């Protein structure tokens, strides 16, 4: 990795990561059929078979109540949580597309006994129809012949325990769907077996290395996905699931963090904060900015950002991470009369810009408190120290190794006078701050 610490804006930039951009959504429809259990009844008294059959009956009956929908500039705040909203909007839209009686009858006659039976919709979307039929095979070969004149208290408990381990999948999936009201936050191991997930991955329409990265990083792909109920038709329960489609792979990405620099003289403060912290990635020559943190996640040397919440910017923004003094691009900052002891956390190291009022120092696990921190915009690396302590709050540093560089520069806070410093502002460009200073002095 590469870490660069800019003194003149009190910022850190971390580059050298590798891109994974979640861009597409693959709709995947599953069905599981149960049979004529509605005409199967236990009337010979209590039994384990009777209780598990009643559990299956109650589960499939309460599954019907869930019927989808309602059961039948500040860049950070603008994009706050919009990716999840867009994802669930696309999910409920494609769910409304596939919740048609002609469509489900067509998909049932199309699937027959061929497992993957890929089909199309009215507007036309790949869906990858798949049925799982192990419980139908069990009930057709064993259970109907086992039941006779509603005698469910048979001596063969092997049939009972095999029915338990078979219907545990259906009971599990309906229990997540009851717990999450049809909108699951993630994918459990019961919704996707590894073979089914691999089959869905191999049929995802994308290139070779895209499929490779889909394969060896499947666990948090399962974390990213989510499944939506469709309904019960005939004896078949049909649901779907959205799989992420990673389209943009192996591009450098960087993350920028900052803390306010406060010029101080004679009890006079002037603090400035860069407001463009977050992720930046490249694709097809264009720059995509992710200001939120929940949308994007690191793993190893790779990053996983969502293009739905991202915004499109130009290349010149990079030049205000290097040459903020002489830049033409007016990238955003914020102004203040008071310092804030908010701590910056680089992926490799850390930064603390604590000021008068609190105490700051560093510590190591093996030895103890190493040294105190002088007041100012201070940077620290995991090589020099293990933990950073401000007053009574302790923060840990990750031990991911890399190489670092510090750009020497006079802080841009010191070029202004706190006397002529303007009122507090939110998300205004640095040239706007300079011209506000010029207007207030004039």
């Amino acid at each position, epitope marked *: 990795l590469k870490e660069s610490y800019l003194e003149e804006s009190c910022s850190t930039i971390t580059e050298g990561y590798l891109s994974v951009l979640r861009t597409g959504w693959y709709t995947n429809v599953f069905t599981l059929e149960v049979g004529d259990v509605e005409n199967l009844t236990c009337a010979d008294g209590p039994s384990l078979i009777k209780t598990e059959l009643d559990l299956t009956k109650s589960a499939l009956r309460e599954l019907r109540t869930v019927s989808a929908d309602q059961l039948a500039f500040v860049l950070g705040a603008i994009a706050l949580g919009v990716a999840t909203a867009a994802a669930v909007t696309a999910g409920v839209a494609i769910a409304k597309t596939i919740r048609l009686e002609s469509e489900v009858t067509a998909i049932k006659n199309a699937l027959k006994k061929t497992n993957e039976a890929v089909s199309t919709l009215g507007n036309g979307v790949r869906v990858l129809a798949t049925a799982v039929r192990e419980l139908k095979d069990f009930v057709s070969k064993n259970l109907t012949r086992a039941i006779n004149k509603n005698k469910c208290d048979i001596p063969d408990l092997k049939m009972a325990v095999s029915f338990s381990q078979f219907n545990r999948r259906f009971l599990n999936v309906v229990r997540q769907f009851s717990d999450n009201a049809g909108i699951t936050p993630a994918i459990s191991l019961d919704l996707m077996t590894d073979a089914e997930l691999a089959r869905a991955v191999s049929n995802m329409p994308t290139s070779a290395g895209q499929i490779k990265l889909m394969l060896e990083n499947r666990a948090m792909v399962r974390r990213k996905g989510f499944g939506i109920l469709i309904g019960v038709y005939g004896s078949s329960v049909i649901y779907m699931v959205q799989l992420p489609i990673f389209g943009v792979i192996d591009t450098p990405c960087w993350i920028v963090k900052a803390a306010p620099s406060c010029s101080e003289k004679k009890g006079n403060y002037a603090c400035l904060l860069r407001e463009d912290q977050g992720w930046y990635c*490249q694709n097809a020559g264009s720059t995509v900015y992710y200001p939120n943190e929940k949308d994007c996640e690191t793993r190893g040397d790779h990053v996983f950002c969502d293009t739905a919440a991202g915004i499109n910017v130009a290349e010149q923004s990079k030049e205000c991470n290097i040459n903020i003094s002489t830049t033409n691009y007016p990238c955003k900052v914020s102004t203040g009369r008071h310092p804030i002891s908010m701590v910056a956390l680089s992926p490799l190291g850390a930064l603390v810009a604590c000021y008068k009022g609190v105490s700051c120092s560093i510590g190591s696990n093996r030895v103890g408190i190493i040294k105190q921190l002088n007041k100012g915009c201070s940077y620290i690396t995991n090589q020099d120290a293990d933990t950073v302590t401000i007053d009574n709050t302790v923060y840990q540093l990750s031990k991911v190794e890399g190489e670092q560089h510090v750009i020497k520069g006079r802080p841009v806070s010191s070029s202004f006078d706190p006397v002529k410093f303007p009122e507090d502002q939110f998300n205004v460009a640095l040239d706007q701050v300079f011209e506000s200073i010029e207007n207030s002095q004039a």
Partner: antibody
Amino acid sequence: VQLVESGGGLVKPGESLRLSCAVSGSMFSSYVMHWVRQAPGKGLDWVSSITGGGNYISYADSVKGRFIISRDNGRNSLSLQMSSLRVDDTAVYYCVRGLSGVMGVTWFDSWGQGTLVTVSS
Amino acid sequence: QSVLTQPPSVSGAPGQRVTISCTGSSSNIGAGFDVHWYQHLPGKAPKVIIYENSHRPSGVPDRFFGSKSGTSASLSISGLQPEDEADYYCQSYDRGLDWVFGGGTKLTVL
């Protein structure tokens, strides 16, 4: 955006040569890149795909194993080692950029002039 | 030996419509993705002529129209001024881990 490459000529069957490609874009590491070939009098045929930095490559089945691909983003250069030849590889080679769409699909565009390579005898 | 098949036997008078048919199989095209077409005049490096089956880039006249449907892709060319004499090629992403092109088709104007 223009681009150039060189490294071919009259080559006996079997030996390994280097094809160096010197594309000069605005910024380099964003683009997947590809090599394609043009046999004289036949149709075009895809040779190789390489993504941004050196980890996810693939080849055509006819040229699997016999070809090595790499790229230096710092030098802004592209490198191919070509080895273990048989005579039907006589063709003109093209470096192509990978300006992608809204998905994993991409189309070749802004093609190079090409470099001619002869293999037989 | 290209799996993408298209007839290399098209020519005619200037002005009228000429149609190119490019057809594969379900693994070739299907409905997941698309076909991109490239033109190649002799004496110069070939350039892309249409991508995403409709998106004309900068520097191409609107005489060129393309479509895809089912597994079959159709080119319609009208207003043949003599300079549009070239070879035409398809591309596809069939799942045999290979980026297969088409068979190539010559187009000349009498």
